[PDB]
């Protein structure tokens, strides 16, 4: 399965599944500072799933590793802001992270395998 470009549609499909998850609601658009006025005091690099989808669709990711780094930033940012491990939004972030990691694993493996085959 040595298609170097196949990761992009696989990531579009995975983002579609993440948007269907009720657990993605809080992460679907850039955080609003009116509700959380100190957000940029704690969070240096805001990230959300709409920004990840737009970056993919603009052709501004070179690899699925770069998309994975941005999705992981959504989850680390949510953790940086949670007042507790028992908070609702943080709890939704942990389930969504587990779902994302379960699905991205093969996308990364296939891509890296395809690049190694190209350079063989
Ligand atoms: C009662 C509050 C309503 C939900 N809002 C809320 O608590 N949020 C702050 C923390 N957060 C994030 O850090 C984050 C990462 C990616 C997108 O947002 C999620 C959400 C916007």
UniProtKB/Swiss-Prot annotation:
Superkingdom assignment: Eukaryota
Subcellular localization: Nucleus
Tissue: Expressed in myeloma and epidermoid carcinoma cell lines.
Modified residues (Phosphoserine): 1, 91
Disulfide bonds: none
Residues of the Bromo domain: 2-107
Protein function: Probable regulator of the insulin and insulin-like growth factor signaling pathways. Stimulates cell proliferation through regulation of cyclin transcription and has an anti-apoptotic activity through AKT1 phosphorylation and activation. Plays a role in the regulation of cell morphology and cytoskeletal organization.
Subunit structure: Interacts with IRS1 and IRS2. Interacts (via bromo domain) with acetylated lysine residues on histone H1.4, histone H3 and H4 (in vitro).
Protein name per the record: PH-interacting protein
Source species: Homo sapiens (Human)
Primary gene name: PHIP
From-to range in the entire protein, with total length: 1315 to 1434 of 1821
């Amino acid at each position: 399965s040595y298609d170097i470009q196949a990761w992009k549609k696989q990531c579009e499909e995975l983002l579609n599944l993440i948007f269907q998850c009720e657990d993605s609601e809080p992460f679907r658009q850039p955080v609003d500072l009116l509700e959380y006025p100190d957000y940029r005091d704690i969070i240096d690099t805001p990230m959300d799933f709409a920004t990840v989808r737009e970056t993919l669709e603009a052709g501004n990711y070179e690899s699925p590793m770069e998309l994975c780094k941005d999705v992981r930033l959504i989850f680390s940012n949510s953790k940086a802001y949670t007042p507790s491990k028992r908070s609702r939004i943080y709890s939704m972030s942990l389930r969504l992270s587990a779902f994302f990691e379960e699905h991205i694993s093969s996308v990364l493996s296939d891509y890296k395998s395809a690049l190694r085959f190209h350079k063989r």
